[PDB]
Amino acid sequence: AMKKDSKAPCVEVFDERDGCKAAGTQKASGDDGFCVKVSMKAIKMNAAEATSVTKNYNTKLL
Amino acid sequence: AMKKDSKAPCVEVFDERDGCKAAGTQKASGDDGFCVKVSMKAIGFNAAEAASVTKNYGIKRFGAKS
Amino acid sequence: MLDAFSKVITSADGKAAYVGGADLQALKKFVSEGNKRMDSVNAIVSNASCIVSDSVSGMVCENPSLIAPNGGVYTNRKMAACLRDAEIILRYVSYSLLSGDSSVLEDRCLNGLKETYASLGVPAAGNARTISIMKATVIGFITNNSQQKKLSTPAGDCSALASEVGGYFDKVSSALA
Amino acid sequence: DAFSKVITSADGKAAYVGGADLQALKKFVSEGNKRMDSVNAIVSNASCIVSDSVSGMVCENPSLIAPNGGVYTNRKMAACLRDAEIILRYVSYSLLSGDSSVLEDRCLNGLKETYASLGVPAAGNARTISIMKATVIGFITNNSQQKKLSTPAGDCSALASEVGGYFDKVSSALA
Numbered sequence: 001a002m003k004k005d006s007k008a009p010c011v012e013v014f015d016e017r018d019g020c021k022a023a024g025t026q027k028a029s030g031d032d033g034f035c036v037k038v039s040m041k042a043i044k045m046n047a048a049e050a051t052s053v054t055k056n057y058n059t060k061l062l
Numbered sequence: 063a064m065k066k067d068s069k070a071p072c073v074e075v076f077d078e079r080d081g082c083k084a085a086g087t088q089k090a091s092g093d094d095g096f097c098v099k100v101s102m103k104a105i106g107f108n109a110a111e112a113a114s115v116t117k118n119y120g121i122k123r124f125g126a127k128s
Numbered sequence: 129m130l131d132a133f134s135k136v137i138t139s140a141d142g143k144a145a146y147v148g149g150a151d152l153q154a155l156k157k158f159v160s161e162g163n164k165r166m167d168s169v170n171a172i173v174s175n176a177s178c179i180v181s182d183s184v185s186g187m188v189c190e191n192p193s194l195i196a197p198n199g200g201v202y203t204n205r206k207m208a209a210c211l212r213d214a215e216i217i218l219r220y221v222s223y224s225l226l227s228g229d230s231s232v233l234e235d236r237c238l239n240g241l242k243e244t245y246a247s248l249g250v251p252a253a254g255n256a257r258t259i260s261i262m263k264a265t266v267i268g269f270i271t272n273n274s275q276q277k278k279l280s281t282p283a284g285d286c287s288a289l290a291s292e293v294g295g296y297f298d299k300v301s302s303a304l305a
Numbered sequence: 306d307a308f309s310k311v312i313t314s315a316d317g318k319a320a321y322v323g324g325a326d327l328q329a330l331k332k333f334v335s336e337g338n339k340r341m342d343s344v345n346a347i348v349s350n351a352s353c354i355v356s357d358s359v360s361g362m363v364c365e366n367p368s369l370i371a372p373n374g375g376v377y378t379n380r381k382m383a384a385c386l387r388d389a390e391i392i393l394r395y396v397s398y399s400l401l402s403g404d405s406s407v408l409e410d411r412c413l414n415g416l417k418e419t420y421a422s423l424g425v426p427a428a429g430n431a432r433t434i435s436i437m438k439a440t441v442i443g444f445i446t447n448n449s450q451q452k453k454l455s456t457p458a459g460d461c462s463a464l465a466s467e468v469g470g471y472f473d474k475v476s477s478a479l480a
């Protein structure tokens with residue numbers, strides 16, 4: 001059932017084949033450069049984006 | 063002196079005069095709807111944006127001048 | 129483990145799962161066109177904000193009564209709830225594309241949604257248009273038909289994955305009609 | 306001093322100013338309300354401002370992305386986009402506080418020399434800053450074409466000139 005808690009799967013995809021590493025980001029096992037992160041997060045309301053759409057909806061992407 | 067630690071002031075501005083409040087977000091005294099938040103954080107690299115600029119730099123967006 | 133992603137859906141620990149190396153190689157093999165599929169999921173999530181904003185904006189610009197008094201997204205509070213919903217739906221679609229099926233989308237996002245919207249007066253026509261624009265936008269990225277921003281991928285044909293993600297949006301549309 | 310201490314704190318943990326404190330802060334600098342909308346314009350659009358400016362630097366001089374180029378490889382491009390955002394944020398803080406002392410002390414002092422040692426090209430920086438400047442002034446003066454600010458209609462030319470001056474401080478330091 002849809003739980004009414006605004007929680008959705010947030011997926012992040014990483015391709016670090018170029019060899020560039022940030023400290024404290026190694027959280028899975030592997031050395032081929034690939035990683036996928038998935039978490040369940042409450043999707044929060046975004047007042048700034050809401051305000052902008054109200055103002056700017058009639059403008060197509062330029 | 064510039065400290066080479068990537069740290070910069072991160073300012074957020076809030077105008078909640080419309081009376082919409084989110085639970086647990088009251089962080090200072092006041093009821094006029096205004097707040098300013100400032101923290102000092104290291105600004106992180108954004109691989110996705112970098113990859114996109116490399117690909118798309120030649121596209122003029124936003125109705126900008128050449 | 130092949131349940132790496134799916135365990136997150138039911139977990140109560142609030143912890144992310146990270147899948148790499150052999151575990152990721154197995155999950156990519158488990159579904160079709162693993163590499164192009166990851167690029168497609170990445171296209172959705174990396175652009176989620178602009179996808180949601182352009183879609184809700186197009187819903188309003190084609191039907192500006194939605195933002196007039198008594199309208200579906202009149203007031204910032206309602207406009208925010210709508211953009212939030214569009215994002216939630218977009219994210220369940222992104223997960224469907226990652227996992228290779230719509231079971232979680234149907235169970236945790238769509239099951240009971242139409243009833244909720246009916247009780248709230250969230251207009252079905254507007255919802256239909258937001259979904260159709262989100263669908264068009266995602267297909268646009270995946271098929272190299274995005275004019276403002278192209279994906280940074282090897283050149284090739286992603287039409288099968290575009291059809292698959294299209295099917296996922298269609299599950300949403302059919303549930304809410 | 307509420308914000309000032311955030312700059313000098315060890316963890317840089319968030320401070321919040323609201324109510325009477327915020328009211329007093331707004332009274333100490335000119336046009337407090339328009340100033341807050343102006344700061345909000347910068348930070349709310351930080352990603353697009355930085356992206357369009359660096360993009361323009363490169364489309365004007367595509368050799369910057371060729372081998373040996375200032376932003377060749379994702380690692381270098383990302384460091385550039387980071388610096389652009391860092392500078393933009395020190396500029397936003399200058400507009401908030403009404404002066405450039407923190408910008409000069411913690412962002413600009415030593416920056417030209419650091420860039421000299423790395424081979425970060427001054428001409429590219431100059432273009433990136435000029436575009437960031439034009440973009441921000443664009444928002445504040447209702448000249449942005451894709452997205453307009455949600456503010457009461459009026460004139461913000463004085464604040465646009467002020468923020469222009471903060472960008473010029475950056476340009477001068479890096480020239």
Ligand SMILES: */C=C/C1=C(C)C(=O)N/C1=C\c1[nH]c(/C=C2\N=C(C[C@H]3NC(=O)C(C(*)=C)=C3C)C(C)=C2CCC(=O)O)c(CCC(=O)O)c1C
Nearest residue numbers: 120124126127128353354360361364439443449450451452
């Ligand atoms: C934050 C994104 C923006 C939204 C949303 C919006 O409505 N406007 C936005 C940005 C913006 N950009 C400018 C000005 C310039 N942008 C560029 C880079 C662009 N031009 C090119 O030739 C290329 C490469 C193909 C680009 C990526 C340039 C050169 C400028 C002009 C800078 C100058 O005037 O010296 C503005 C300012 C208003 C305008 O549209 O010109 C905004 C608001």
Ligand SMILES: */C=C/C1=C(C)C(=O)N/C1=C\c1[nH]c(/C=C2\N=C(C[C@H]3NC(=O)C(C(*)=C)=C3C)C(C)=C2CCC(=O)O)c(CCC(=O)O)c1C
Nearest residue numbers: 058059060178179185186189261264265268274275276277
């Ligand atoms: C994620 C933002 C985008 C980037 C970056 C990019 O390169 N393309 C992006 C978005 C995108 N949008 C569409 C399609 C549509 N967008 C709208 C809304 C727009 N049109 C309007 O009339 C108004 C109100 C004035 C808007 C805000 C609409 C209606 C569509 C068409 C939907 C359909 O086909 O039924 C696409 C798809 C490719 C295209 O340009 O159509 C992209 C990639």
Ligand SMILES: *[C@@H](C)[C@H]1/C(=C/C2=NC(=C\c3[nH]c(C[C@H]4NC(=O)C(C=C)=C4C)c(C)c3CCC(=O)O)/C(CCC(=O)O)=C2C)NC(=O)[C@@H]1C
Nearest residue numbers: 044045046047076082083084088089090092095097208323
């Ligand atoms: C109603 C649902 C709105 C909406 C509100 C949200 N506000 C969010 C964050 C937030 N707001 C403030 C300002 C508020 N707190 C104060 O202490 C004072 C004045 C004394 C005010 C005016 C702050 C400081 C914050 C951040 C809190 C923090 O830093 O911990 C917020 C959270 C967003 C998120 O977490 O992603 C929401 C949802 N949002 C909307 O879209 C509708 C219109």
Ligand SMILES: *[C@@H](C)[C@H]1/C(=C/C2=NC(=C\c3[nH]c(C[C@H]4NC(=O)C(C=C)=C4C)c(C)c3CCC(=O)O)/C(CCC(=O)O)=C2C)NC(=O)[C@@H]1C
Nearest residue numbers: 014020021022025026027028030033035107108109148383
């Ligand atoms: C070098 C400076 C790059 C760059 C790298 C960054 N990566 C960041 C986050 C991140 N990366 C991964 C994938 C990595 N971890 C693994 O365990 C594996 C495989 C086993 C890989 C390939 C993950 C999982 C994460 C996030 C970790 C988390 O969620 O906490 C990252 C962080 C950005 C940030 O902090 O916001 C950086 C900077 N970034 C660049 O732009 C250059 C090119």
Ligand SMILES: *[C@@H](C)[C@H]1/C(=C/C2=NC(=C\c3[nH]c(C[C@H]4NC(=O)C(C=C)=C4C)c(C)c3CCC(=O)O)/C(CCC(=O)O)=C2C)NC(=O)[C@@H]1C
Nearest residue numbers: 014015034035163164166167168270281282283284285286
């Ligand atoms: C439609 C989606 C796109 C398109 C995509 C293609 N991607 C191709 C190959 C490819 N992509 C990746 C990265 C991907 N795999 C991962 O595991 C992750 C992160 C976890 C990502 C982001 C890899 C490793 C590969 C294969 C090796 C390579 O070529 O670099 C690809 C080539 C065909 C194929 O391999 O099936 C295509 C066509 N291309 C397009 O034109 C649209 C926009």
Ligand SMILES: *[C@@H](C)[C@H]1/C(=C/C2=NC(=C\c3[nH]c(C[C@H]4NC(=O)C(C=C)=C4C)c(C)c3CCC(=O)O)/C(CCC(=O)O)=C2C)NC(=O)[C@@H]1C
Nearest residue numbers: 076077096097338339341342343445456457458459460461
């Ligand atoms: C140039 C920047 C803009 C422009 C801005 C104007 N803003 C005006 C008034 C105004 N703005 C706010 C909100 C602001 N004050 C705060 O404390 C915070 C958050 C902490 C924010 C976001 C208020 C409260 C006010 C005054 C009350 C009101 O009128 O709503 C304004 C009116 C003139 C003035 O008050 O000085 C202008 C012109 N307008 C533009 O056209 C450009 C784009």
Ligand SMILES: *[C@H](C)[C@H]1/C(=C/C2=NC(=C\c3[nH]c(C[C@H]4NC(=O)C(C=C)=C4C)c(C)c3CCC(=O)O)/C(CCC(=O)O)=C2C)NC(=O)[C@@H]1C
Nearest residue numbers: 004005006007200201206209210216237248250254255258
């Ligand atoms: C935007 C395209 C729509 C629109 C959307 C609105 N939705 C509103 C409230 C709302 N939405 C949901 C479903 C959401 N919560 C979840 O947990 C999940 C999935 C896991 C989803 C998809 C719920 C449960 C609710 C009610 C409770 C809540 O707000 O959190 C909403 C507010 C309506 C009102 O209060 O009157 C709006 C405006 N509205 C539109 O006009 C377009 C078509």
Ligand SMILES: *[C@H](C)[C@H]1/C(=C/C2=NC(=C\c3[nH]c(C[C@H]4NC(=O)C(C=C)=C4C)c(C)c3CCC(=O)O)/C(CCC(=O)O)=C2C)NC(=O)[C@@H]1C
Nearest residue numbers: 066067068069375376381384385388391412425429430433
């Ligand atoms: C982008 C518009 C430029 C460009 C920028 C690059 N900067 C690079 C490294 C770098 N930048 C700084 C200054 C930065 N750190 C701070 O703490 C502050 C202010 C508080 C700023 C403004 C430092 C200290 C460094 C080196 C150490 C580090 O990265 O943390 C950089 C990498 C260069 C290289 O490694 O060779 C680039 C590419 N490059 C361009 O071409 C345009 C003009």
